[PDB]
Every structure is written in C-alpha cells, then in structure tokens.
Amino acid sequence: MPLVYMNIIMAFAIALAGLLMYRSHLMSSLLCLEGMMLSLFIMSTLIILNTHFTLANMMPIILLVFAACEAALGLSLLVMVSNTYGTDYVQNLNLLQC
Amino acid sequence: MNPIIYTTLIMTVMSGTMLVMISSHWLLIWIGFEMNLLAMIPVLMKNFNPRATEAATKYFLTQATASMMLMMAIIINLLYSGQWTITKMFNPVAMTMMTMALAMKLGLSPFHFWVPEVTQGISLQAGLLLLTWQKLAPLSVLCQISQSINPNLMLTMAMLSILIGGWGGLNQTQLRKIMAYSSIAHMGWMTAVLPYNTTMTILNLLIYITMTLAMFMLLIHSSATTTLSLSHTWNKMPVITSLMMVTLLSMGGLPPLSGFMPKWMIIQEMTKNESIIMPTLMAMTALLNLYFYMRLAYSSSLTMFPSTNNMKMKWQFEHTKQMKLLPTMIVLSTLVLPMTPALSSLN
Amino acid sequence: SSLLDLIWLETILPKTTSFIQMKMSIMVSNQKGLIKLYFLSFLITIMISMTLFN
Amino acid sequence: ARQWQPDVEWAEQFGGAVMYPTKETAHWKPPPWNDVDPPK
C-alpha cells in the first residue's frame, strides 16, 4: 500500500472530521460532504486504473453523477431553511429535540 | 402534492429498496440506497411546515453521511481484494466502517439521535413509512454479510440500543417519540441475533413491522398525537382504545400475545451458543418498554379521562375513510403465537 | 409493619429501581436537539470503535 | 359509592412537554396542536 492511497484516506478522514465538527454554516457541512465525495472519486479512479479493471471505469462517473444529485437535493433543503429563518446557522434547527 | 407524483415517489422508494435487496454488486446496492434517500425526502415534506423541513434536513444529513461511509468501506474492500460481489468482507477496517454505515442507516445507538426528532417533526403517515419500510434494505445487507461482522461490535451496539430505547421511552409524552424509541429498542433486540441466526432476525422484523403498522394505523384512525389527545378517544370510539391496549400489551412481550414470539425465540438461539448473560440483560431491559406501554394503556383505555363538551358534535359523524388491512394487522400482531413453528419457512 | 414493610422493604427493591430508572430516563432523553453535539458524539464513537474493537 | 376516575388534576400530569420535569426543562413548551409554527 503506497503513500498515495494513505494520503487519500487521510484526506477523506479529515473531511469527515470537518463535517462532524459543525461550527456553523450548514453550507460548510455540504462542502465537507462533497470533499469526502471528491476523495472517494480520486481513490476509486486510482484503484481502478492501477489494476486495468477496464469494465470498472464506469464506476467513478456513475458515482459522481449520483453524488452530485444528492448535493443538489441538499442545497434545496438548505435554501428552505434560510427562507424560514433568514440565515443558515446550524443552531437554529432546535425545534425538534429528544 | 399531486397524487400521481406521490405515487411515483412511493414507487421509486420501493424500487430502490428492491434494487438493494435483489442486487449482487456493491455499486448497485449503493445506487439503490441513493435512490431510496433521494425519493424519500419529499414524502417527509408532503405537509409543508418548518418542523417537517428541519426533520427532512436532519434525515438527509444523516443518510448522506451513512452513504458516504458505506462507499468508502466498499472502496477499501475493493482495494484489499478486487471483488465487487457482496460476500465476505475480506478486510477488518472495511467491515467496521460498513457496520457503522449500516448502523447509521438503521438507527442503532449511539447513532440513534436522529430517529426521535425526525419522527416527531414529520407526520404520522410519513413516520409509519419511515419506521417500517426503511429498515428492510440495511437489514438485508447486514444479513447478507453476517458471517463477516464482528460479534463484539454488533452485540455491544445492540445492547446499547436496547438500553437507550428503554430509558428514553419513559420520559416522552408525544406518541411519535415513544414510537421512535420503541423502534430503537426493537432494532437493538433484532440486530443482536444477526451473528447467530438471520432467520430469527427476519422473523423479528416481520413481527415488529406488523405490530408497528397496526399501532400507527390505530393512531391515524383516532387522530391523536399527544397522550391527552389519545386519552380523549374513549369517548367516541372505545373499540379503538381497547384494540390499541391489546396491541400495546402485545408489543411489550407479554405472552400469549404474538409479541412474545420473537424475544423468546431469539433468547433460545442465543442460549444455543452459550450466551446467557446477554439475553437476561435484554429481557430485564425490555421491562422498561413494557412499563411505558403500560402507562400509555392506563392513560388511554383502562381509565376514563375527562372529556370536552365539543366532543358531542363528533358523536354524529363517522370515519369517512377506512384503511384496509387494519383488522388483519391487529390479528397478526396479537394472536399468532400458536403458529410459531411456521418460522421454519425461512420467512 | 411501618419500619420494615412500609419503609425499608419498599426502599430496597421497588423504590430504588424507580429512582434509578427515572434518573437514567431524565439523563438520556435530555437532548437540546442540536446536531452539532450529535455529530461530535458520532465522531467520538467512530474513533472509539476504530481504535478499540481492532 | 362511585368508582374513582381521573379528574383534571390527575390529567395535567401528562400534559407537559416531558415527564418528570426538571429545572433545565421547566422552560420547554409543548409543540403546537397542529405541527405549524408562527412565521415570525
């Protein structure tokens, strides 16, 4: 296992930690999700190209498409939150509680 | 929304779950999960309001994080063994991460925090669909790789889920949060027998789905969300309160009602593998579920709470819409203990 | 009658159980609904399972 | 000569946001009867 894969997994872990930290600005949470997705794309592309698994070259593109769709969905939700509160601070979503 | 669009979204949710269950490729399973998540969001937001929007965004964040973790686990498994088929994981780290992803998707503790709030924000119909249908894909995936899952992680997460559900159900007053904690506890019960016998997992899933479908249909029939709104029901439809109390007793594990069949059977299986302490602990913990079910039954049917004058007008009107399969659900969730051996059908 | 049956036998088995379960229910169910704390706990449990169960 | 049945005082115990009220949750408010909040 070379250092490139280690660095890519480190980037994914850092992006996951950033997503889970949640300072504010839900847009930052979406950005962290998409950074995780980009790391996934890079890692999968490297793994598939290294082993000459030809028929698997479809996998990254497909992945990207679906993930981008999710991003769009997320953005929509974010917009509605702002339209109800005027801003997208995370701490405003406290009506529902355990 | 338009009825055609609602039907299309429901078909898409079911198609995503079917694709997850009938596929032998990790990428196709991930695609099915993504389709399910994509089509499930508007179902939560059918009745537009700030609470529904907040619940939907919490659900989306949790599901997206779980899906990303699942894809990372798939990538690592592919890296350490160039296999796409859903079989032995061939890696410990990939198995651990996939177990966390499926726990996030299911709602097992400590990833359980989103379930009560999402259930509370969204409507009864949305909640009913979320509570029962969503469980089928992650549970199928877990059953398909049960030979590779680490018993320690699954067992400790199941024990924590049972404890958390039992403790959190005591405090809640709204019925939707009680149902969310009940679901958490039932899934803690159900995932504990995955390493040993998946047939018991499927049987518990079927019994739990029947019970919660019956209870949610009863709650929809008598349009009650809080405890007092349910207490008012006896003045109009006492039969509904009686049936709800019987179903609540069944859901607590009281024999000879149907809800005793899974727990008992599950215990039996864990006794075959020389696991004695854990089944005892889970039984004494399910006593808490029984307690808050009994409190709800006391509030609803066994005592007559004060009514209101305007309720007189409700005596003159009948329920215009009748939901089919409610009597069947009640009967299946209450009086099917004597047919326990039918579980050999590998249901 | 009073000291054993009505006071201490009640205190040992039923009352202690009731008090402990009430305290645990209050502790568990008291969540402000912030997803910041939820996801911080998610990160903590991910780290704990990664370093402990392997 | 009459079987006791719950009155208003007994029913108000379950009317709160959560059971077993504490100092922290004394200021919590029950959700609205319909799941709609004021637009403010």
Place this chain on the structure above:
Amino acid sequence: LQYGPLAFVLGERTTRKLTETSKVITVDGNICSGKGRLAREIAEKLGLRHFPEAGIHYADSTTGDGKPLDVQLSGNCSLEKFYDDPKSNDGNSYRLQSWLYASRLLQYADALEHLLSTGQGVVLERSIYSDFVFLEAMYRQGFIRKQCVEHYNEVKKVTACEYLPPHVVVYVDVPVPEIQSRIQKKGNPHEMKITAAYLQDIENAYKKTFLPEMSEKCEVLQYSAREAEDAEKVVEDIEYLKCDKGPWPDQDDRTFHRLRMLVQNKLEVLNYTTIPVYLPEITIGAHQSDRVFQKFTELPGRKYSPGYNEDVGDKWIWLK
C-alpha cells in the same frame, strides 16, 4: 365512487366548474338586523344557495334525520339561559359560544364542499370570521374570563388557518337605539334583557377590528339600514367589483383538490375543536361523559353506521 385521489387522477378537476359566479359571500350584521332578509334576497337574485345561520342544533340537521336531538345530547347549552343569566355560575356563556363557533365551522366546511363539488356559489350569515365579536362583547362585559378568550383564540387560529376567506363581505349597519326599538318590537321575552352596552360592544368590535381586517384582503360593502332594503343596488355592487387581491386567484387545481379533501371528512374539520385544555366551562367529568354517551347511543339511528340500523328500517343488513 366518492371523491378521492383516484377521481382527481382520472377526471375530477374542480377548476373547470368555477365560472366566475361562485363568489362565496357572507352577510354579517348586528343582533336583530335585516341581514337575514337581505341574505335571502342576494341568494335568490344571484342564483346562489343560501345557508341559514348556524344555531345550536345545526349539526343535528345534517346527520341522520334533520330533527334536532335533545339539548343534553347536542350542545348542553341554551341561549335563553345566557340572556337571562349572562353571568351564570355554571359557565353557560362559554359553552354556548364554543358550540356556536364549532357549528359555524362545520357550516363553512359544508358550504365550501358544496361550492367545490357543484360550482354553484353560496351565501352565508356570520361565518367563523366575525364570530369573535360576540366573544369580545362577552369578555368586555365581564361574562367570561381571560383564559376563556385565550382558549377561543387558540382554537380559532388552529381551525381557521386552513380555509379561504369569503370573496365578498356585506355589512348592514344599524344604530344601537334603532335595534333596541326593533328588539322591543320583536316580542321575544328574553331579548329585551339585552343591555345596550352589550350591543354597543358588539358594534364597535365589528367596526374597529373585523372590518379593516376584511378590507385589507377582501371587498367590503358597508350598508346602512335604508340602503340595504334595495337588493338591486346590492347585486349591482356585487357584480361591479372584481376580486383580484385575495388568495382565490392564486389557487390552482392541486390546492383546490387538497381543500376539497379537507372540507369533506368532517372529523378532521372538527378535530381541533376539542384540544386537551381543561377549562371548567367546557370540560366534562368521566362519569357525565360516559352517561351522556351511553344515552346518545340508545337513539334510534345512532347505534351503528348510517346504513346498518335495524330499528330505523334498513334491510339486507347481512349482505351490506
């Protein structure tokens, strides 16, 4: 084939039936005014359907036989007792007010259902809107407490946040001495006990609050006692004005379908009229509720569903 999502899927579109003549109109006036006579004339001339003002026994008219039931089984309140003893110790005033408000809500739901199902418009007396003026009159005179108006406001907001306000508001203005003279001429033994302050509070609660709120979002036709006699001018005014400020133009086929699903199935309409807030005026003990419900069940056509009553005369019971 009752209306449902399937009917909407195939053929049932309610935007086709509306032909600019629907124009749900509420005729509102002070106690013992000429509005009732006026409302009937407007419905006759415009071809609409007139709905008589909802009383204590309005709901009894639409369910089973139209014959009203006993006062104990429907309303548990009386208007004559309110007039005789406005400060009655047993909280008759609020019980009357709530029963009347819920009856008006049911009538509004029925009118909207008829309008959406047929396309023919409706004419109404005092609706759910403008019903709060009686509550204000009671409260300012001291008949009811503050918690009373708080509960009424909660129920009203929850129930009325889901209905379309009427197209046109017609108001008949009558001075207090004139209506006092009309009341004296009426001869109803309980009505001369109405104080002048009560009528003044009703009138100024009408004018100060209800009228501007309707004006800002609808059309208001303030008419005096004389000019309201000539229904021809009223109808001409109704035709001349054009509705372009309310939510009605913004409604589409989907929103109309949702509203039509809401107006039928009266249980959801009345769902929030019995919210679990325990005021002493409206709450009923367990024993009283049990006894009254048991007595209600013994009524001829009330034990079972409408079509499954043997004593009434329904046949073929074992095959329905």
Place this chain on the structure above:
Amino acid sequence: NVLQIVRDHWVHILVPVGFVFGCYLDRRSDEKLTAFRNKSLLFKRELRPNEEVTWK
C-alpha cells in the same frame, strides 16, 4: 312456544355440545397412541377368541 324459545334458549346447548366434542376429541387423540397396545411387558395378554384389540 316451539321455534320461539329456540331463538332465546339456543345458547344453552353450546356447553354440552362442547363437552361431547371434547370427549370425541379425547378418544380420537387416544387413537394415536396405540403403538404399545397389548405389547406391554407387564400386561401382555393372549387375545380372546372374539377380541380384536385389548382396549380402544
């Protein structure tokens, strides 16, 4: 009155009918445990000339 008391006293026949049904079911269930009839090492008996089974 015949055909009139029946509509009010038909419920009385339920319990005795249940008793008879239970007796019949008990005999039928006993018919399934004849794997050792007249084969017990203690009550092993030679059959009578006009006897086919030791017990029913």
Place this chain on the structure above:
Amino acid sequence: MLKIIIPTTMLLPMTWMSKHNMIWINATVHSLLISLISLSLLNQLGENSLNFSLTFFSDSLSAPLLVLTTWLLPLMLMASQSHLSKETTTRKKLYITMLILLQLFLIMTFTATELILFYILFEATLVPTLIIITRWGNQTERLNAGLYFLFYTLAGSLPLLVALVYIQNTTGSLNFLIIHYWSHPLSNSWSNIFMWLACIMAFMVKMPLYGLHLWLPKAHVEAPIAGSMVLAAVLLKLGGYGMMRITTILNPLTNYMAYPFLMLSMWGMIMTSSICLRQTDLKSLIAYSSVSHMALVIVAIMIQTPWSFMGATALMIAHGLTSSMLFCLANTNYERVHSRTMILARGLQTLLPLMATWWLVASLTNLALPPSINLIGELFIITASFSWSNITIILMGMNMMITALYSLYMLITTQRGKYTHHINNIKPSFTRENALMALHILPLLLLTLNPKMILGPLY
C-alpha cells in the same frame, strides 16, 4: 382433558350471545356444570399419572387444584353480581370474558406436561388479572397496585425462561416425565447455583416469600372482590405447584441452598402474623394472613419430605377456600358500610346473626381447628419441620398463637360489642350472600371426611 377445556372455551360464545338480563344465570349454571365434569379427574391411581395425551397429563397434585379452580368461578360470578348492577351489558360481558379466560389459562397451566408450555400459560394468567384489577377497581391506587403486581412477577419470572431454554439445550427435553426419569445430580458450582436461583426465584416471588410480598397487600386491597378471591385462592398456588414440580432437578444443591429461604419464611411468618394484629383494614389483614400461610407452605416445600409435600397440598387447598370465604365476608360488609375499616362498623352480630355465624366458622377454620384440613396440613408441616430440626417448633408454636390471636381479634372487633350508632343502612343479608358463604364452607367440612383426596401424590 379436552372434555374440560372445550366447554370452558364454549362458555365465551355462550356468554356473548346471551340476553342482556340472563348472562349471570347462564354463566353460573354452566360453570357449575363444568365443575361436575372436573370431579372425574380426582380418581387418581397410585401409579404414575393420568397421561391423557402428549400435551396434557393429570396427577393427584393437579387434580385438587383443578377441581378448586373449576369450582371457584361460580362463586366469583355470584360475588361480582352485586357491584356490577349499574354496569352496561358490554362491560359485564367483558368482565365475564376475563373471568372465563383466567379459568381457561389456569386449567391449561395446571396440567401442562411440558415446562415451556407451563411457563407460557403461567405468564398468560397475568393479563386478565391485571385488566380486572386496573379496570373494575374502586380506589385510585389500583393503577399502582397493578404495576406492582405485573413487575414483581415478571422480574422474577424472566430469568426462568432463560433457565428453561438452557435446560432444554443441555438435557434435550422439558417434558416432565422425561425430566423426572432422567434426572441427574447438580454439582456444587457457581453456574449451578445461579441455575437454581433462576429456577426457584420465579416461583418464590409469586407465592410470595417474605421480603418480596409488597405487591400482595396492594393487589388484594385495590382489586374488586372476584380478583381478590382468584388471587388468594388459586393464583398464589401457582408458585407452590411450580416449585414442587421443578425441585426434581435441583437436588442435591437444595440441601444447602434452602437456608436463606427457610430462614426468611420461618421469620416472615412471625412478622406477618404480628403485623395482622395491628391493622386498620380488613382486606389488608386477610392478605397478610395469606402471606403467613404461604410462607409456611414455602417452608414445607423446601424441607422436601413426603409429609412436607402432603401437608403443603392440604394447606394449599384449605387456605384457598378459607381466604376466599374471608374476602367474601369482608366484601359483604364493605358493600353496606362503603368504608372498608375494621373499627368503623361494630357489633354487627346483633343486627346480622347468620353472617355472624359465617364469620365465626370462617375464623375457626382459619384458626386451624381440628379436624379441619387446615390443621391437617399445618400439623403435617409441623411434624416434618420438627424432623428437620427440633428448634423449629418454637417458631411454629409462636405462629400458631399469633394466628389464633389475630383471627379472634378480627372476629371480636367486627362482631361483638355495641353497635355503632350513626349507621342505619345495615339491611338484612340477602340470600345470595348466605348461599355464597354456604358454598364456600361446606366443601371444607366435606373434605375433612376424605383427606386422601387432597394429600397429593406422596400419600
């Protein structure tokens, strides 16, 4: 056995299709008829059992309890006929349905050739009882009483399920015949100690043992009359029956694992007998008397000698009948008085002489007077415990003296003395109550003629 189970099931459709004013008559008549059918089971043989089929078997231990269970239901109906006068037809039919379901579950429990089926019905007997207690109860504490009764039982009985499935996994069968024939000694180990505790605690909690009896006074006080009699007469015997059935596999561990329970019972009998002396309530006093008698039965079962078992069975039947009679009498007093306090109504013997006679007979029977079966069981247990150790006689004699004291205190406070002046609604006793007392007491004085029918399999 189905000749008994099937008519009990048919009692339900019989009740539900009866006329609105004839449910009590039909239920009583057919319950009595069912009891006559159950009488045939009493003719046990010195050999193994009456093995009816693969699912049900009857012994000479199950026969007396089954006959008592089938006999109790008509008395429960006659007792409940009083306070259900102002009840709607549907609720009265539901009450009779609950009683019938309770009887059916008990009948299926007492035979139950397999231990898992026995456990399933043993816990099934808990739902109708809880519904009866929490629904048709007068006081506002019926809810707490129902919760206590449910949880005290279920917490004890939940480890029993695990123990039973473990035994099935190792032994291979839970049929009682196979269990008895293939029994093997239990080695002295921590695992075997905890198996013993799991298998014993579930039945000791229901008996109840001293220290776990807190649920019984609440359940007996807050329940209606029928619930009180079914709790005191039959539901307490489930624990003892299960313990005498299951102690066949716990040897020889019991030889030293019985010490804590023996000491607890032999001291709690004295404690509860003393508690009975200073009591402001009648039903609470009777409940504590039941606790004392059941503690004596616990001692007898734990001694594990033939005389112990014979005395235990005799005391079970006798205490069931006596406690049912005492609860009946207390309910008849409470219906007129509407207070349920011992010293509020006094000198009732001057106003109701025949009820005073019934009170005297019930107190004498509770006092363990010879030659009633109460004293037969008492004396058998005393002799067996004396053989166990010569010092038990001190505790047993103290219990006997205190029992006599509180029984005669109960009789004297409510019957003798000057009547209370400000009570003028003591109507003459109906024929229903007199018939109820007669049907309670005559079987006791009849069974004293044929003791061998209630002395168990070790006779």
Place this chain on the structure above:
Amino acid sequence: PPEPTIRLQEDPDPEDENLYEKNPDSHGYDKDPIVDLWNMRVVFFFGFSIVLVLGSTFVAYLPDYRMQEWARREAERLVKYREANGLPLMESNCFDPNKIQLPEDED
C-alpha cells in the same frame, strides 16, 4: 376571583339503591323479580342439589384405583408365606446382590 370554584361538570354521586325497598323478597340477585327468583332457583339447585350432593356421593364411591386393598392382600400373602417358611420377613436389600455389580477398588 370570579372563578366558579367548580373544577369540571360532574354528575352528583348517586345514592345506593336498596333492593328491598322496591321489592321485598329480593334474594339479592337482580332487580327484575322473575329473573331474580329463577337465578336463585338455578343457583340453589345446581350448587347444593346437583354438585354438592351427587358429586360428593360420586367422590365417596370412587373405585379403588390407588390399590389399597390390593396392597393389603399382597402384604397378607407375603407375611403368611414368610412366616410359614421361617424367612426373616422384610429384606434389608431392596435389590438382590448377585445382579448388582460393584466396581472394584483394590486400593
């Protein structure tokens, strides 16, 4: 404080209805005299007459399946045989020694 001091609307607690006042010879069974009388009749007939007497006689005359007289006769025959032939009555060993095999110790 214009509060009515009434917490809720409730029926007054009804007074207990005496079964004798409207119907002497009341039997304490039901308020309908005919159904009441017949309830008393069936209770007394099926409780005392049918069960308590016929069942008591049936239990009294139950056939001896416990084999008490059979055991007495067997003991009589055994005692007579053992006394006539000088055998020592009861035998100390329940099972004959020859059939039993004891593992050898050789310790």
